[PDB]
Subunit: 261 residues, 4 copies
């Protein structure tokens, strides 16, 4: 069908992209980077993140495939030497699609803005101290003071969430995980400490206490938001779809990336 | 209907039990500790754990209620002063049932035995070093050496799982979480470190490397198992049913128990 | 002798300062904020930090005293109601001095600058990724990638160092502790993870890998340093001197601030 | 001088021992396992621990040397291929001695017993719950409930202490570090959480609350002590002496064992 290929931009990924385009020309495969039905990312996980946000408005009509020219990524889980076998299998079709949950972030002001995250979304202060009240389904849970907070998708738990002590989470679970960044706990400040895992339709809201400026990240994107009234996290109704051609289980991918390959 | 009441055995819980039995005598409520349809636990979370394992073979025909005479427990979430209002509401019926997932543990030998856990199940060594190979859905994930491993239900994540760095997990999520107890990580030993969260139908198997004797705990029960060949963890098809009369959300219960009440 | 008093600037601390000045006027006590021999800080730990850096060039000729108008601080360990008893005891003299170690930070460019820290000094990136090589006594120990690194004094271990998992450390130990901020550990990145505690004359040097811009903090001060070639940490030869009038042990102060008071 | 050699007992270490004995016979070196002045340990760190406790009553008249037949140990820091160069250098003498601090453990009953630890000493319960009051220099610091507590020497911080989140500590620092094993922290139980580092002459005392039976470990030794009234930890006045022939810094040894070799 219609397809497009993005590249890390280095010498290896560019020519792998040109070789796959040539191989696709031998089939009923049309290159289209406007309405593709298959998006191939050649590079690292950062390259795949850019490809996802490049087409985050047609997620239900797109199947993503990642090819790792460097090391094995959690999203780019195809080796470069298997590119030709991928072209053939991709041209035929009749493959199985696999869907991972995504994180919806809403930032209200005093017109709201929404973002979609594949890894996570984090909130930090704009210079001074970071203090927010954490509200869960309209119930005040805690007043957090520290460096910041991180809300991760299931597939994002092996990323920033992992470095913050968060738990690793299978992507078949439609949920999101909240982790602390250097929370203060003394006589006057108290947080839960533990990571929190929230199911679908649970809404975690962050509300300012004094400063209303926050540095909000969505995957690699990081924007300074001013006059913030609320930051709302919830599992998105949208999901990302991967084209899967062989069995590469999540825990196997975890083992290869962190234990040994 | 048919009901029974268990007690912590102290002076306060025994007389609260006798007062509720008397109040139940004014309704169409029959006391039966053989085939009860409502099981009332008066005491702490340990008292509720004993009540659960006391009737773990009729979980689908029983609704549990916990009353905390000491402090607020995650399972005993009714105050003693609300006992009479509980009797009346319980006698009428037409209440809503709430179900939490449970953990199935299977211990094979060289005849297998199965156990049901409401909080967690843990494995430790019988004296010497603890070394097990961790297999996930027939895939070897890691060789663990340390003090032990803990597999927690969602409602158990606020218990032993919490003290081991595990994440707190909403009980609507049908899953189980594995946490490490003092794992060794050097040049020759490597573990994931992070807690792992497994969905339904995922089977985590522990297999001995040298010593085949393990101290296996299931909630408060702790038995020394000899000649062990495998320990299988998976989310149980069985679920525990709570009788719920008012809104007491899980995160609110977490806030009251750990942040402030 | 010569003395000065600094204030948090709020209504309570200003008038407590004026009352102590008046009480000092009844003794052979001269107010001098240029060459004081006793520096009294009225406010929080942040107020005491400002008083320390206000006179960091005459530390060997100054004894510090902290009065906490808000809550008990680790440095402001005198209650406001004990101000008059403090005036009398301070006027007589013949008190015992207590010394805590300090952290020396050196930032070299391509003219070096030195800083003195009572709590800690931290390094973060200027926007992008933070990657530094960690060198210990001219030996390359690790390549760190993450949010940043924190080097704490003994008295600073109960502060930022504590929130990062660092160990609490008695101030009689002349040493410094290094803790990680969200380190990346996968197939390509490896750090020690554990906090490191360094004795006197050990030099920990941070060296850039790509980006040479770093946000370097020294207690409350935080400056963006450009064209950085090296950041050198070592236990300072300088020490801060506290005027001590009664037994208030460090672990007791830890118990009151974190366990209960 | 007088010397002795202990062996792991496997085929490789036994013959390396016999070869060094033969090489020692060509010098003024007398084999004596009763009053040796040089103790050579061939095996792992466990073999070295046994050699230390084998001669813990003549530590001031003994210099220890570790040879690692398996992997590099923190105490056995000599490769087997360097055995002959070690014989020659050891026969000549005039080498530099290096001393590490040790941990003194005292267990009182209702006749006290004292132990010496090179790695650490830990306390756990005898079956039920572990609850102790922690007293620091006669001041009650906390009531600990959990799995247990670990008190580590500086050289022991890279061992069990490391797996419990403790900080790594240079052995030139005469001190001891206390770490928690799965502490309970809720509405009724509160511990410091962070590891604690204690200087010389600080006495940490553990006192029972209910159960007076404890499983107390001292390095590899683990004994069930009954009718316990107190467990006293303090930095020992005794120190272990290593024979050092070349520069092998502690942090370099840490890097090789945990980062890469
Ligand atoms: N202090 C931090 N610690 C940990 N992580 C951080 C931090 N700061 C930011 N980040 C992560 O940086 C991401 C952006 N950069 C591209 C990517 C990625 C990635 N995604 C995953 C994943 N889902 N699972 C396992 N590894 C992953 N990586 C791998 O992240 C590593 C770092 O970039 C590379 O090794 C990727 O290959 C952010 O989104 C956040 O997650
Ligand atoms: N080193 C340990 N650290 C933490 N925990 C441990 C440990 N060792 C064992 N355990 C837990 O001991 C349980 C058995 N005892 C009755 C109970 C309970 C309980 N269940 C929960 C829950 N689900 N959520 C929040 N708190 C809970 N408790 C509360 O546990 C506290 C301790 O008993 C009391 O404060 C209960 O009130 C085991 O099952 C395991 O979980
Ligand atoms: N994410 C962070 N987490 C923890 N900490 C951080 C963080 N970010 C920054 N910081 C600390 O902020 C300090 C600057 N602000 C004044 C102070 C202080 C202080 N010093 C100590 C101390 N030595 N021991 C115990 N508590 C202390 N405080 C108490 O810090 C709390 C916060 O300000 C107040 O409760 C003080 O009372 C920095 O220096 C760094 O340490
Ligand atoms: N759950 C646990 N987690 C961590 N550790 C534990 C645990 N349970 C017990 N232990 C440690 O077991 C020691 C007894 N066994 C011989 C040894 C040793 C040793 N000493 C050190 C050291 N000083 N620094 C770095 N590594 C060291 N080892 C290395 O410990 C590893 C395990 O035995 C091997 O890799 C040795 O080589 C105890 O003393 C305690 O420390």
């Amino acid at each position: 069908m219609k397809y497009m290929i993005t590249s890390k931009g280095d010498e290896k990924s560019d020519l792998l992209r040109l070789n796959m385009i040539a191989g696709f020309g031998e089939y009923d495969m049309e290159y289209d980077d406007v309405e593709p039905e298959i998006v191939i990312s050649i590079g690292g996980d950062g390259t795949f993140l850019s490809a996802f946000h490049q087409y985050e408005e047609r997620l239900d009509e797109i199947a993503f495939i990642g090819i790792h020219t460097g090391h094995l990524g959690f999203y780019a889980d195809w080796r470069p030497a298997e590119a030709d076998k991928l072209v053939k299998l991709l041209a035929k079709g009749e493959y199985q699609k696999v869907s991972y949950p995504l994180l919806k972030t809403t930032v209200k002001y005093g017109k709201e803005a929404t973002y979609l995250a594949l890894n996570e979304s984090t909130v930090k202060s704009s210079g001074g101290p970071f203090v927010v009240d954490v509200v869960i389904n309209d119930i005040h849970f805690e007043r957090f003071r520290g460096d910041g907070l991180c809300m991760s998708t299931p597939s994002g738990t092996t990323a920033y969430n992992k470095s913050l002590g968060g738990a690793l989470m299978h992507p078949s679970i439609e949920a999101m995980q909240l982790t602390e960044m250097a929370s203060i706990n003394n006589r006057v400040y108290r947080t839960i400490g533990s990571p929190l895992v929230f199911p679908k339709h649970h809404v975690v809201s962050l509300q300012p206490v004094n400063d209303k400026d926050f540095q909000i990240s969505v995957d690699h994107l990081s924007i300074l938001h001013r006059d913030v009234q609320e930051i709302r996290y919830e599992v998105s109704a949208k999901k990302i779809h991967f084209a899967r051609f062989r069995s590469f289980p999540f825990w196997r991918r975890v083992h290869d990336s962190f234990i040994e390959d």
